Design a protein around this nucleic acid. Structure first.
Length: 115
RNA sequence: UGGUUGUCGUCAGCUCGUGUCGUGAGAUGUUGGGUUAAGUCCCGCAACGAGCGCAACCCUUGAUCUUAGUUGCCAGCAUUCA
């Protein structure tokens, strides 16, 4: 079922054998995904992500491509969660506390320029 | 041995935290592009920072404003060997 989408999906010769369970093959040389194996997977993603945003860890939305910038930004500012619109800084999660320091610095200085 | 100095060298380096990579020694930052007197600064980056250095503040000289005119100065006021 094509619900709304446009994705046949991507790549030429550089492709991964671990997606043999998901794709088809066009005579173009660019691969077309079996969308019947797409609708059910986004359905389970939909359900489990409803459960996760029902429990209360917020959600990270991270997109670090020129296509991904305005999309992930506007979508997370629509949903209220935590986005990445530019580079993904090395160690936001495993190095979490020194990023909390630098974001508190940003909070101090953006309060400082008006208060 | 303390303390105090030379020298590399006023060279621009030397490190650390947390993270990640590596079996480990180590790596990373600190590399790359431009830039600088400068690891100076920017941009990209598995890194984000920080410290000692670099620079700046400090002293002098270069100029002008205010205060302050004696022992310093003599512009217009006359006398003076001055």
């Amino acid at each position: 079922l094509l619900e709304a989408g446009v994705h046949f999906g991507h790549q030429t010769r550089r492709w991964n054998p671990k997606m043999k369970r998901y794709i088809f093959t066009e005579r173009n040389g660019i691969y077309i995904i079996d969308l019947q194996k797409t609708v059910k997977k986004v359905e389970e993603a939909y359900n489990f992500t409803k459960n996760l945003a029902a429990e209360g860890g917020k959600i990270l939305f991270v997109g670090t491509k020129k296509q991904a910038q305005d999309s992930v930004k506007e979508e997370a500012q629509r949903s209220g969660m935590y986005y990445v619109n530019q580079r993904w800084l090395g160690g936001t999660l495993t190095n979490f506390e020194t990023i909390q320091k630098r974001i508190k610095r940003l909070k101090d200085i953006e309060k400082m320029q008006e208060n």
